[PDB]
Amino acid sequence: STAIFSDRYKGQRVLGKGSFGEVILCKDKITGQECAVKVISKRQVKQKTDKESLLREVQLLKQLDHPNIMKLYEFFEDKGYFYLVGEVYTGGELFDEIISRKRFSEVDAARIIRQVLSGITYMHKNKIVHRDLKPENLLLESKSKDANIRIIDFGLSTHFEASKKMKDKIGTAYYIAPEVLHGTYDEKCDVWSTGVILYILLSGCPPFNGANEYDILKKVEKGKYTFELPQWKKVSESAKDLIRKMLTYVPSMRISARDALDHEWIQTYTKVPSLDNAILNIRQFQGTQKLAQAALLYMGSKLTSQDETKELTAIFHKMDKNGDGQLDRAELIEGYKELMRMKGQDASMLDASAVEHEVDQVLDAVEYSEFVTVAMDRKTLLSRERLERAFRMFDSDNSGKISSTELATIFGVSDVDSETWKSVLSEVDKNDGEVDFDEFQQMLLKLCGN
Numbered sequence: 430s431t432a433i434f435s436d437r438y439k440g441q442r443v444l445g446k447g448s449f450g451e452v453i454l455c456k457d458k459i460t461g462q463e464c465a466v467k468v469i470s471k472r473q474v475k476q477k478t479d480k481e482s483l484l485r486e487v488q489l490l491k492q493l494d495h496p497n498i499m500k501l502y503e504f505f506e507d508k509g510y511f512y513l514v515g516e517v518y519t520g521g522e523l524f525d526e527i528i529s530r531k532r533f534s535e536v537d538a539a540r541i542i543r544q545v546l547s548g549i550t551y552m553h554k555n556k557i558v559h560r561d562l563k564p565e566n567l568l569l570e571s572k573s574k575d576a577n578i579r580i581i582d583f584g585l586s587t588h589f590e591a592s593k594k595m596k597d598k599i600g601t602a603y604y605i606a607p608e609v610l611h612g613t614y615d616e617k618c619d620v621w622s623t624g625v626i627l628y629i630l631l632s633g634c635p636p637f638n639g640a641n642e643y644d645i646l647k648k649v650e651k652g653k654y655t656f657e658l659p660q661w662k663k664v665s666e667s668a669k670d671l672i673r674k675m676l677t678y679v680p681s682m683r684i685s686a687r688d689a690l691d692h693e694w695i696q697t698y699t700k701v702p703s704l705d706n707a708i709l710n711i712r713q714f715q716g717t718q719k720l721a722q723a724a725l726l727y728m729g730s731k732l733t734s735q736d737e738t739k740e741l742t743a744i745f746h747k748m749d750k751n752g753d754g755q756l757d758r759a760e761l762i763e764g765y766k767e768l769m770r771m772k773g774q775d776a777s778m779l780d781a782s783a784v785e786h787e788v789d790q791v792l793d794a795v796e797y798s799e800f801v802t803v804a805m806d807r808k809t810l811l812s813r814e815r816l817e818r819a820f821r822m823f824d825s826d827n828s829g830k831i832s833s834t835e836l837a838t839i840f841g842v843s844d845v846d847s848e849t850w851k852s853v854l855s856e857v858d859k860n861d862g863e864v865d866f867d868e869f870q871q872m873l874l875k876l877c878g879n
């Protein structure tokens with residue numbers, strides 16, 4: 430409120446797009462301490478509670494400390510944004526580390542879940558519920574195999590409204606507790622979500638699955654699942670018993686996070702065959718989720734580029750006094766600053782110094798029409814290379830193609846209607862039942878107006 434964020438911190442690099450907003454690697458201008466700042470835009474996110482309830486939870490969260498909980502250092506608020514400043518972790522997402530290794534057993538799964546439960550138990554004792562616990566929120570403290578897990582976004586859910594855009598809801602339906610869907614829930618919803626993560630660690634397949642978001646939510650609401658897949662034969666009976674207690678439908682009957690640590694499976698496997706079939710399915714699952722996410726962000730970046738391309742052309746056309754199509758470097762900065770003044774402050778461009786530098790980078794490469802193409806191509810370049818990398822990673826056999834069955838699974842996770850993508854495919858392809866990267870990219874372009 431009183432203190433300004435930009436006067437203390439400077440943006441160094443974009444870490445990624447998390448829940449509620451963009452995540453930026455920032456650095457203190459005095460001490461040089463690196464920090465990860467989640468920037469939540471007030472227009473794209475609505476406040477569920479009042480301002481005084483939010484400040485009270487922020488104050489509590491700043492005093493909490495646990496080795497498996499991400500530390501919240503500071504909190505800032507300006508006219509249109511909320512900035513949540515915390516510690517940086519470079520180890521990446523838990524599931525990205527599991528797909529790289531060749532050996533994964535119940536001892537590794539028990540060591541993972543013991544950490545997740547230690548953090549949850551500690552936060553539940555302080556009356557803080559996560560509500561949106563999922564593998565994406567489990568980060569590794571360092572780039573190593575024996576590194577600590579840190580749970581992020583612990584306590585946001587209660588004060589910020591969930592996004593309705595599929596690019597942000599991707600992969601959430603698998604882990605949500607049934608009682609969260611019907612409205613009456615408490616801290617037991619985090620035990621269910623951890624139970625779902627444990628089920629995926631030991632088999633590589635979600636317990637509640639479907640061809641789309643709604644079919645998954647129907648399975649979660651019914652609450653029925655089975656240990657009827659071949660890979661569950663090589664898993665112990667105590668692991669299955671803990672999952673049964675964690676995935677109990679009635680929350681009052683469901684085990685607590687505290688009692689889940691004292692369970693025989695945690696006590697025996699933290700104080701042993703390799704689950705090879707489970708690794709292959711986590712690889713397939715992670716690749717499928719990441720390609721679906723990359724496809725949705727690619728379409729979103731193409732629509733954002735079209736909006737900003739025309740908006741920046743209109744700003745520069747009005748600034749062109751004589752009408753030769755040219756402008757000075759100082760004029761282009763005024764017009765680029767006007768784009769952020771009209772279409773909101775950018776996550777990468779925190780202050781005027783970052784805008785002046787962003788223009789100098791485009792001016793070094795590059796008529797304002799040519800400059801418009803470069804500045805917009807730089808924003809699309811960050812999204813097109815992620816799509817190709819995700820397509821290449823999904824294509825594990827390096828065939829260069831993805832089958833029609835794989836497209837149905839991808840578009841199913843992305844929530845693109847079955848009849849809509851099949852029609853778009855016939856317009857570009859026109860019939861081997863498989864598409865290459867360019868054809869896949871052409872389908873996404875046609876699925877967002879281009």
Ligand SMILES: [Ca+2]
Pocket residue numbers: 824825826827828829830831
């Ligand atoms: Ca292939």
